[PDB]
Amino acid sequence: MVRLNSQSSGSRQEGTVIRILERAIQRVVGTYTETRNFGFVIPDDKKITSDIFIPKNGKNGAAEGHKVVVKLTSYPEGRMNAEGEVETILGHKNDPGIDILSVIHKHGLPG
RNA sequence: GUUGGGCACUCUAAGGUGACUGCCGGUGACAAACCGGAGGAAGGUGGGGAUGACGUCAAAUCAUCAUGCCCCUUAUGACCU
Numbered sequence A: 001m002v003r004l005n006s007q008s009s010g011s012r013q014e015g016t017v018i019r020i021l022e023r024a025i026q027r028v029v030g031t032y033t034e035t036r037n038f039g040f041v042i043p044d045d046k047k048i049t050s051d052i053f054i055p056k057n058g059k060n061g062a063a064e065g066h067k068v069v070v071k072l073t074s075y076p077e078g079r080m081n082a083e084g085e086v087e088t089i090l091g092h093k094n095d096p097g098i099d100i101l102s103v104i105h106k107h108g109l110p111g
Numbered sequence B: 001g002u003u004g005g006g007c008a009c010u011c012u013a014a015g016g017u018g019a020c021u022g023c024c025g026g027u028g029a030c031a032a033a034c035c036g037g038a039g040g041a042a043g044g045u046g047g048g049g050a051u052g053a054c055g056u057c058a059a060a061u062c063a064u065c066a067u068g069c070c071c072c073u074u075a076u077g078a079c080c081u
Helices: A098-107
Strands: A027-034 A039-043 A053-054 A066-071 A089-092
Touching: A027 A053, A053 A098, A066 A098, A089 A098
Parallel strands: none
Antiparallel strands: A027 A039, A027 A066, A039 A053, A066 A089
16 A cells, blocks of 8 residues: 655655555565574565575475475564465475476466 | 692793684685684684884974084173072
8 A cells, every 4th residue: 555755756656665455475485595593595586685584393394405485474574574484395496397396386386 | 828738720921722714504617705504712804002105394302412603601601598
């Protein structure tokens, strides 16, 4: 429910997400990465500019390499990132036929 | 500890050790790096000091000191109260 601004530093009208009327992106696919004694799945697409906090109870295989879908169990909060889990361990990200299989789960195609 | 009590511990102070990308994951030219993880007292330029290049102001100092040219030289020297 983006609101207008009474300014514009360009040719475009300035929106501002004063509120989110609806949540979409229910789930993301990505590579899981171990950080500072933690986990963080990086979304397949770069359109999500943040990572997804993985707690250990939602690691479920995902190591440095493994591709996994995330049933996002929480979402960003001001400065904080989205939390999640690990769904399907698609396989090591650098595998021939993951490129397809990654897209198979990205789009939410049948199986 | 006051005393007996090796002296352990703390300390005292000489000599060594120790830290680096050395290591293990990512990431990335397989390298470098970057990002984390170990282990360690110490994490990625360990921390404080010390130690620089050519220069300028005819900068300041003839009251630190010395000093050419002067000046004083029974006094501009010197002594006391």
